[PDB]
């Protein structure tokens, strides 16, 4: 079973699923004038991504059309994006999200940071393969052309998916690395950024947790305070994201959802990416952390800043109140 499915998702396989039944219902809802969005919503948000792909294969066969194109020609705005995101294979969606983050004059460093720090090593290998297949350029090369300095080096390190996959924790290595981090930053003039990058990007999460514990004992401070006093810019943000994900990935993503839902305006691109990409992995834990940290559920948060068909689809993905 797939590397894209976790133990705490809000979207699961539908036992009574029938691809020909669903494809026929979707074709009816989008064909002719008017669209039955409640129908598209009731089906697609109640099928896992694996089943949706079966709907996709069954729709191209029977109607000679790609469901993605039917959805895009009929739907609009944020609802359209969210609906198209649901029927995209997970590796392909992250690849498209990575490419979107580096297009035009701007560059969305925050999205780059979010994706490269939360995907496991096996997921990154998949994303790199899909990116290469769909864009015919390596992910490393595009990352390289849109970034510079230490941030660039750390992103390229992450894009390779070589973070240690072992399940072992070595007390001895943790103490040694804590000492190297201290010498690389606090203990010298300047900083050996390469060392920060090498340890924080290649040791396993459980190993790093131990390392941060040892770091605190040696330095009398948290690794976060050293990163803040030693580094700056996007490189600093990247390293803090790694530390936050090492301690609690769902809380980091909950914070990202929180920031996308308030302020100057709603960040629908981030909301869509997190809701869809974590729906079959850990959205349930994201919901728990969101409520623990903010005092209100993700569900009520979505209800207060979104509306219409877009709001219903996100509430259905959310799967419940906390
Ligand atoms: Ca129509
Ligand atoms: Ca760009
Ligand atoms: Ca220093
Ligand atoms: Ca330096
Ligand atoms: Ca700083």
Swiss-Prot record:
A GO CC term attached to the entry: extracellular exosome
Annexin repeats: 17-88, 89-160, 172-244, 248-319
Keyword Calcium in record: yes
N-acetylalanine modification, residue list: 1
UniProt entry keywords in alphabetical sequence: Acetylation, Annexin, Calcium, Calcium/phospholipid-binding, Phospholipase A2 inhibitor, Phosphoprotein, Repeat
SMART domains given in the database record: ANX (SM00335)
GO molecular function: calcium ion binding; calcium-dependent phospholipid binding; calcium-dependent protein binding; phosphatidylserine binding; phospholipase A2 inhibitor activity
Cited Pfam families: Annexin
Biological processes annotated in GO: defense response to bacterium; neutrophil degranulation; phagocytosis; positive regulation of angiogenesis; positive regulation of DNA-binding transcription factor activity; positive regulation of endothelial cell migration
Phosphothreonine: residues carrying this PTM: 266
Family annotation (PROSITE patterns): ANNEXIN_1, ANNEXIN_2
Annotated family: Belongs to the annexin family.
Summary of the function given for this chain in its UniProt record: Inhibitor of phospholipase A2, also possesses anti-coagulant properties. Also cleaves the cyclic bond of inositol 1,2-cyclic phosphate to form inositol 1-phosphate.
Domain notes: A pair of annexin repeats may form one binding site for calcium and phospholipid.
Protein name: Annexin A3
Organism: Homo sapiens
Originating gene: ANXA3
